[PDB]
Design a binder for this molecule. Structure first.
Ligand code: FK5
Ligand code: CA
Ligand code: CA
Ligand code: CA
Ligand code: CA
Ligand code: FE
Ligand code: ZN
Lengths: 174, 372, 111
């Protein structure tokens, strides 16, 4: 099929996967797409077990939707998984973490963005005043151009101590 | 362009919780730092609020405070001879915002004479503020404010606990090494009104007369054992006054070093050196202070413990205390804690704190997708 | 893997099970007694769904051994805490943790 052939060789060049792996991803991709619509809906995602009771479910789906159509097609499904490849680069894994706190996808992390994302994960275990304070100090220490917002470079120069490669990798998968 | 509003609504484009003050983003200028009355000393009125708002100084500014205070402490002898009236304070342990209520309870340093027994750092996450404040205070009142050395004013415990991490975080290691060399100039003891020996820890089997304190070379780090160690580490025995042993000293298996001293040990020291009591700190008291057994010769408590850190470690929920002493009357005032801003454990920024949970849960879902 | 030392008695009737929502105040100390974190620092008890992998194995197996209102000492070996990796800035590798916990609430039943 000339149609599917163009999307296949394209993903084989951009993704950190190989041809044989992309066939297995297409298998599970169709295993979730229960209505055969060629994409995955939010109700189709939350239909999985571990995904439903997960505080980062809505964040993961949003990052996968690179265009923002409420659906995850195969090109997006492969793009989101490529960052977690054992053969994947360090910069690729850091960008997925950055997008977790960048809700509006404007390339910067703001005071409100940081507070809202954390409060969702934290809950009531931190007082609202306590989370706002630790967000205030985190930004001012990471900001170096006085914009009051955190760019990707300022985010990397702060999580350098953290080993994200171990956090953001699957290895045995695929 | 994407613009998100969350439901009374709020957007990501502004601070969500507004009632909480934001930190001091800007290091002070030369007009703010230097006093208008004396050009060689910092402005206490500015520093107090600047540190209250979680502000920070230049590296040059912090170093000047530690070196100019260190020159004052070095000139002072090992054994101070302070005079009444005076306010004696216990441990503060990096609790800067309680140090503010301490000075309201004890008195304004311009009108009052102070004696701190050390332990200004560690545990609390505002330790460099207490130091840079009190060191600045020493510059303004070197004849009326006296600071002593606790077991935490060294390289040993600051590296083992939180103070070395704080200096590395809020300033630099150059400040830390400047802070440690400044601590070595702190006097070790004090004789208040020719009646009370004032130390941090307690007595020692090498401490016999006050002349033994005068012979110490205090310009080093506290050793593993000996006089200079036990001065900062010794505790009274648990059953003090009610002891079941005729021993004068016993090994301190609680601290791991130095000794316990007993009632008979304290009384012998007071009787040989014509002293009325021993005023020390070290041990956190749930009531802020503690009176030990009265001497058989004078009826005055042999040892007094004074603790000035309220709600120690934010879990103890204890009281603090200061010793407002005059010869006619001895008044021990107690105060309660004051809210302080929140810090994650070990000064963690938000991302180091949250990424492991993100890296786990995001990974949990990806694995669940690969096994449908 | 985890040992439960009783400080104060509980009611001995209301014990958490897998799926229950517990509310616990705690204070975490290393073997050397130096504290690393405490919910009492934040003046708010810690809540979680016990027995579902949401917290470390020392908690997911020790909280069921408690009763409502009981003060306890959860002493977790590294294999039941954070392991040979530890927490990068807080919990050193191969650390044995001690959580002094107080089961304030199970589900919605207050103590
Ligand atoms: C902002 C989002 C993060 C989110 C943070 C909160 C909800 C605030 C909450 C009070 C955590 C504290 O924040 C001040 C702080 O509490 C500690 O100090 C602590 O006393 C501790 O040991 N606790 C907390 C009380 C329950 C037991 C244990 C825990 O199970 O903690 C859990 C934990 C870290 C599990 C890791 C996850 C990574 C795996 O790799 C690892 O597997 C080995 C196990 C916590 C509850 C996570 O489920 C949820 C989070 O992490 C940790 C020393 C470090 C931790 O900061 C993270
Ligand atoms: Ca679909
Ligand atoms: Ca799409
Ligand atoms: Ca943004
Ligand atoms: Ca910036
Ligand atoms: Fe102390
Ligand atoms: Zn001490």
């Amino acid at each position: 099929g000339a149609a599917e052939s163009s999307m296949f060789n394209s993903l084989e060049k951009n993704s950190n996967f190989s041809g044989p792996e992309l066939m297995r991803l297409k298998k599970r991709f169709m295993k979730l797409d229960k209505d055969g619509s060629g994409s995955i809906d939010k109700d189709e995602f939350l239909q999985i077990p571990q995904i439903a009771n997960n505080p980062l479910a809505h964040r993961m789906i949003a990052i996968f939707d690179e265009d923002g159509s409420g659906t995850v097609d195969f090109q997006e499904f492969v793009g989101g998984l490529s960052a977690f490849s054992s053969k994947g680069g360090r910069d690729e894994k850091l960008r997925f973490a950055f997008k977790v706190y960048d809700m509006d996808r404007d390339g910067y992390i703001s005071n409100g963005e940081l507070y809202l994302v954390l409060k969702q994960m934290v809950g009531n275990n931190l007082k609202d005043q306590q989370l706002q304070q630790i967000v205030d100090k985190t930004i001012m220490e990471a900001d170096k151009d006085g914009d009051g917002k955190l760019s990707f470079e300022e985010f990397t120069q702060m999580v350098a101590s953290t080993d994200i490669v171990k956090q953001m990798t699957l290895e045995d998968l695929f | 362009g994407e613009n998100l509003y969350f439901q009374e609504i709020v957007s990501t484009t502004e601070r969500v919780i507004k009632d909480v003050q934001a930190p001091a983003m800007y290091v002070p200028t030369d007009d703010q730092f230097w006093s208008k009355v004396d050009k060689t000393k910092p402005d206490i009125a500015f520093l107090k609020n600047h540190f209250y708002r979680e502000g920070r100084l230049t590296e040059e500014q912090a170093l000047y405070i530690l070196e100019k205070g260190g020159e004052l402490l070095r000139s002072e002898p090992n054994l101070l001879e302070v005079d009444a009236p005076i306010t004696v304070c216990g441990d503060i342990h990096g609790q800067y915002y309680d140090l503010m209520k301490l000075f309201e309870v004890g008195g304004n340093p311009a009108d009052t004479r102070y004696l701190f027994l050390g332990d200004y750092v560690d545990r609390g996450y505002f330790s460099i503020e207490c130091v840079l404040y009190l060191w600045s205070l020493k510059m303004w009142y070197p004849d009326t404010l006296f600071l002593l050395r606790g077991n935490h004013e060294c390289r040993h415990l600051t590296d083992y606990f939180t103070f070395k991490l704080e200096c590395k975080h809020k300033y630099s290691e150059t400040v830390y090494n400047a802070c440690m060399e400044s601590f070595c100039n702190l006097p070790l003891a004090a004789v208040m009104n020719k009646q009370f020996l004032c130390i941090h820890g307690g007595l020692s089997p090498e401490l016999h007369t006050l002349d033994d304190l005068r012979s110490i070379n205090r310009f080093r780090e506290p050793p593993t054992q000996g006089l200079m160690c036990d001065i900062l580490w010794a505790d009274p025995l648990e059953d003090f006054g009610s002891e079941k042993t005729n021993e004068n000293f016993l090994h301190n298996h609680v601290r791991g070093c130095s000794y316990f001293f007993t009632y008979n040990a304290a009384c012998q020291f007071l009787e040989r050196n014509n002293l009325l009591s021993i005023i020390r700190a070290h041990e956190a008291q749930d009531a802020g202070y503690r009176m030990y057994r009265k001497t058989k010769t004078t009826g005055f408590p042999s040892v007094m413990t004074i603790f000035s850190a309220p709600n120690y470690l934010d879990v103890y929920s204890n009281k603090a205390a200061v010793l407002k002493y005059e010869s006619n009357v001895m008044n021990i005032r107690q105060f309660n804690c004051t809210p302080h801003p929140y810090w994650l454990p070990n000064f963690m920024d938000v991302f180091t704190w949250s990424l492991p949970f993100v890296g786990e849960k995001i990974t949990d879902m990806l694995i669940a997708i690969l096994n449908c | 893997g985890v040992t439960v030392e009783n400080i104060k008695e509980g009611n001995g009737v209301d014990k958490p099970v897998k799926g229950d929502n517990v509310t616990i105040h705690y204070v975490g100390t290393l073997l050397d007694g130096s504290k690393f974190d405490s919910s009492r620092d934040r003046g708010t008890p810690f809540v979680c769904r016990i027995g579902q992998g949401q917290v470390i194995r020392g908690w997911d197996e020790g909280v069921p051994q408690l009763s409502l209102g009981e003060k306890a000492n959860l002493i977790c070996t590294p294999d039941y805490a954070y392991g040979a990796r530890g927490f990068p800035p807080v919990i050193p590798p191969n650390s044995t943790l001690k959580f002094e916990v107080e089961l304030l609430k199970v589900n919605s039943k207050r103590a």
